[PDB]
């Protein structure tokens, strides 16, 4: 009976909080914008069948209209799932991504659309933190193993030199100074320290901006 | 009934005021033109539903047609949002971006359009400033982390040569010199100073330029 | 008479688990993403005729409809193979990949589509692990021959130098220290170490994610 | 009744006068020709609605046709505005940029078109001069901050070596010599000087050339 | 009257057995993956008129169908060749490669399709092994020539210096040490040592995989 | 009545004579061939309305056909301008550029066409000469400023090293000699000489070559 | 009335025998696959009128069909030329090149098509070998010139050092030793040796491979 | 009445004789193959009107059909020109470059078409020799200017050294030796020697190869 509409675009840097500096951090360890990737996920949460379904199942609107029949509630549920509609933008055309939500009332249409949007976005944020955490842990690990191989290189060299000095002061010097470590290793060690701190996983952050905010439609559908 | 029309294209370097010099500074650290990014944001602002809505809300022209009955005014506001009409250009056929505003008179259509444009431009310039501000902060911490780590490396090398020396004037010597710092530390450092002073935020700059300024229409639509 | 529908997309890093960092370990030695290459395998498994045959064959659904007549159990096997319909996506259209499954009941259609999905993800994971194994063994052998050759180079130079010294401390010193080894040899030795350890076989990992999870269909086909 | 036509192309290096070598000097420090940029600007001027309006308003031809009726005078203005027409070349098929102007006699069409073109050239020239000026300000400021940072690096290094020396000749050396500046600093200093001098602005330069100069038509439109 | 259908793709590293790391070895000496090139050969074998013809001719199914009439036998042969139909994928639409085999019964269609597939693969492997031998011998030859040139450069340098010292320890020393070989030479030399061993030619390695194994069709064509 | 035709392509280096070497000389400093570009201007001169007009005006044919009235002679002139038609080629179909001329007699059409061509090459040549001139002058200014600075740098350095020397043989050394000058300085200097000498002006050179020379028509249009 | 058919593709590396390594040897000096180029030569040979003409001219089939009238035999020869038909493949649609030969019998059509293929391949091979011998010869001249010039550079430097040092051991040494030569001269000398040895021409090699071998057609045309 | 036909392609490396190795040399001096460029010129000559005209005027076939009347003979000449038709190949369609010639008898059509292609080959050859030769002249003049500038650099540095040294072994030393010249100067010296030698320009070399040779037509058109 009534529908609201939203039009969206990619989040601002500020909207990603620590995730941004953390994702860039991880990006700038491996060598399309971070915000681009984020919005990619938002669009994906926003479009999901699972997401709409869970939303309605979680919605009181749906619940007060429940009659206690599994088939009817699932038809109604499916219908409500169907009452949320995403249209991908055409950026060749300045048509942006946009979403509409139908309910039996205008206030229901607006508020429900708002709640749905916040819902999809939370799922997106949560998933990007899983991604981040899983990128950080791994980076901490590659460095630990790398640093470790480096320690093994210095150790083989050290032993060889030892054995060459053997066959007298510099034998004692080498013996007490230990293996020789290049700069790369210590750098790897301090990065390892920061990595070992482990990521700040802020679940809050936002994953989209509005170009058109849902409003109470001024007329019926 | 009475409509006015404007046509725009990307702003120039000077047009961006003190924003231009600022963005280039950040681009030259992590390594589409700035003005281009800016015009995209301008277009983006221009076409938005929300922007039109808030304009009329803040516009005396709109405020003056409200009757104090919430539904009729919301319908009227809806009608004015639809009375501002965006027509994206196409650059295969050398068509630029254009915009129309319908109002109840020719003067209103002109003044309102000039105000609507100025309003949009000022809003775009604000969005650009926000992105800058946030990227700069992410950058100050990234390099701060970079420097910190650089200091941990320096101390590990320090404790290591002291230990290597203990086992004499060079002892006390090293004990007095402290960690050895390379050119890049001092450079990053002074850059860190300039990063710390913080960017300058010009709210002045225009984020577009007129190829066609609004004028009073000669006749009605 | 009842069909369930599901929709999948490429996995993410955490989803890929221990597999990711192993694949990346091997790409930085031979010098499109890894989860893209995982998902491509997922889709391919999803479509397979062989997979449908063996799935139904290991399935109680089919078995109870087995009459113990081989031609009819096979024809039923085929029909039920044909009761599974895959529909590829198109990103020009921004349509994601999607699968339908027909069965005699709704709960069966739902549960069977989910099971078939899990079966497919698991077959895909298994395959990816096999590739990793055999490439690891290859690279390991390659490097093994490279280190061997490095040792033969050092021994020819050593033979040359001992002859050149023959023709007296330097003699005994060379005679007792053995051939000299460069940093590349030792680093290669440590990588041979970590390679020789061999890869970690994780069979636990997912190779798709749901955008739409199978649910009980609400009406017949 | 009567109409003139012109065809343009980018100006010569010579027509840009003092503007040309200055735009090139700013080009070689931020590491599509200038006459092209100028022509693009020219053509911009040539194409602008505002430029045509301001032209007629600034044209005696228009001023003289005003009747002191707002409606009639604005309508007339609009009409004359509409009497200047630009066609972008389609350089794929050797059609060059061209402009046509309609008036009530042949001499008027000719004279007004030549004036409008010189006017456009002059505005283009004026504008291109503005672009230049603002870029040269961004740049002077940037060398100052760069040189000052350099000064402060050299100062940190100086200060550091001074402390280190204290715990005696080269000490007093250091004392009296000051920070140690590289060839880079001095180059930047002299440059800083040249930067400090400021730009030349001849607004007289021509910003186009003619491929077809306007002439008096030999028959009615 | 009956057909079996098989569906195929590129072989694995493991299937290529000894073939794979040797093809990669030659690649890391010269400068589309190996398994792709191998597959290109399989596909090549599968589609061939000659291969189908040779298949049927070496097939009992055919021989037993000879009536000893040259013209009926050649035409039968041609038919049977025509009873193996190969269809190329197009990957725009997720359409994979497929082979169908028509025979007079379901098990014949199945067995013969499996058999034809095996035949194409063996021919492909025999051939791929052929090519490998005539790439191994060539790169071997190239490296002897490079090493030989290195010896002759070395010897001409040696001769030059000889002449020059004559005109007294270093004369004898040099006459006793011989030409001075660089790491380049010695590396090329050990590479010669391995290169001279020659490739392992296992003809049994497999050159394709099944996405659909032929099965006894359950209904006629 | 009668008409002639000509067919052209880019000239050859020899045809550019002394001009070629000069344009390539400038090109090898600033960091499409030159005969292509010469030809570009040539074609522009060729198609230009202005060029056709001035051609007729300097011709005896027209003069002898003038009737002594400006309007009638302008109309005649106009008739004759429209009597020269340029047609660009299309190299997709391997079509070259081509030109036609109409006149009252055959010999006039031939002679006039040939004279127009030599005239155009001459204008193109004087124009290309002009471009070359302007550009030369500007580049000379640039290196004069670059050497000025190398000296100010060397001078600042000189001043600093002398002041540093002050607080005794080398003091007199530096005080007599001068600022130190790098190879770059002297090379810049020698080049500055050659720059200073200025360009050889071929007003001769050919700016096109013929694929088809004009001849006398055998028949009318 | 009878026709045979064949289908071909590019040859393999060992099919080209010695040719391939030699062409690869040249390309490595002056720093589209070889097989590609050999094949494209093959295709030019196969389609060629001249080639067909000479093949029939050299055939007993034709010779036994001559009647000794030059008009009639030229007409027959012409007829026999138009009886070999080449059909270009198409990459867009995976069509391969294919060839048909018509004769008065099926056996003739077979043998003759096989003989034509071997003849054409031998002609292509001849051309490729020709191109090779000429590129190698030019390559050879080039390097000799390079060695000569290097010796003149060394002679100029020789003369210069002699005159310089006069104005006594070193004088006499310099006199005995001759000009000085860097490694590049000697590498050039040995390779010049290998260029001088000249290329080996394999005339047996194959310049194509069969996908479909001609067979005796089964029925008349 | 009767017509002959030819088809061509790029000349072999060989057919360019001394020209080929000379074009590569310039190609290697400044930084589409040479044979391609030669063919490009040949094809250009082949299609030229001028070439055909020059051809027929030089033919007895024409002179014998002249009646000593300028109109009939020019018209006949124009007809004679129109009886040779060239069609550029579409290589996408495996269609190569081809030419046809119409005449009154079959032997004439044959013989005349032959003489004509050779005529075009020789014109292309002479032209290519002019391009080469003038490119050589340009290059030689530039080398002379480069060497003199280097000499003036060593001279400036020399006077600097003479003065510096005067203000005593190294004085008479420096005096007696002269300006200091690096290896690049000497390399440039020998190459100027060989540049001064000048190119070899053989005009007999061929500039095309045939794919179809003209023959006596066997029937009228």
From Swiss-Prot, chains A, B, C, D, E, F, G, H:
The signal sequence is none
Periplasmic-side positions = 1-221
Might you report a single GO cellular component term? plasma membrane
On the tree of life, the source organism's domain of life is Bacteria
Protein keywords:
Cell inner membrane, Cell membrane, Membrane, Transmembrane, Transmembrane helix
Has keyword Phosphoprotein?
no
Subcellular location, record wording: Cell inner membrane
- Bilayer topology term: Multi-pass membrane protein
Q: Which GO terms describe its molecular function?
A: identical protein binding; protein tyrosine kinase activity
- What biological-process terms (Gene Ontology) are attached? enterobacterial common antigen biosynthetic process
This protein's record includes keyword Cell membrane = yes
The annotated pathway is: Bacterial outer membrane biogenesis; enterobacterial common antigen biosynthesis
Q: Identify its protein family.
A: Belongs to the WzzB/Cld/Rol family.
The task this protein performs is described as: Modulates the polysaccharide chain length of enterobacterial common antigen (ECA).
Assembly state and interactors? Homooctamer. Probably part of a complex composed of WzxE, WzyE and WzzE.
Q: What is this protein called?
A: ECA polysaccharide chain length modulation protein
């Amino acid at each position: 009976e009534w529908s609201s509409t939203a039009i969206t675009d990619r989040p601002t840097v500020n909207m990603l909080g620590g995730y941004y500096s953390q994702q860039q951090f991880l990006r700038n360890l491996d060598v399309p914008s971070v915000m681009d990737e984020a919005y990619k996920e938002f669009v994906m949460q926003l479009a999901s069948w699972d997401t709409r379904r869970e939303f309605w199942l979680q919605t009181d609107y749906y619940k007060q209209r429940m009659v206690g029949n599994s088939k009817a509630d699932a038809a109604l549920l499916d219908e409500m799932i169907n009452n949320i509609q995403f249209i991908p933008g055409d950026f060749t055309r300045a048509v942006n991504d946009s979403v509409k939500l139908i309910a039996e009332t205008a206030p229901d249409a607006n508020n429900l659309l708002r709640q749905y949007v916040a819902f999809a976005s939370q799922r997106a944020a949560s998933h990007l933190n899983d991604e981040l955490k899983g990128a950080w842990a791994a980076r901490t690990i590659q460095m630990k193993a790398q640093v470790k191989r480096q320690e093994e290189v210095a150790k083989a060299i050290y032993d060889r030199r030892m054995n060459s000095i053997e066959q007298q002061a510099r034998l004692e010097n080498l013996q007490a100074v230990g293996p020789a470590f290049d700069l790369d290793y210590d750098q790897n060690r301090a990065m390892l320290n920061t990595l070992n701190v482990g990521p700040t996983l802020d679940p809050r952050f936002q994953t989209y901006r509005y170009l058109r905010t849902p409003e109470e439609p001024v007329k019926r559908d």
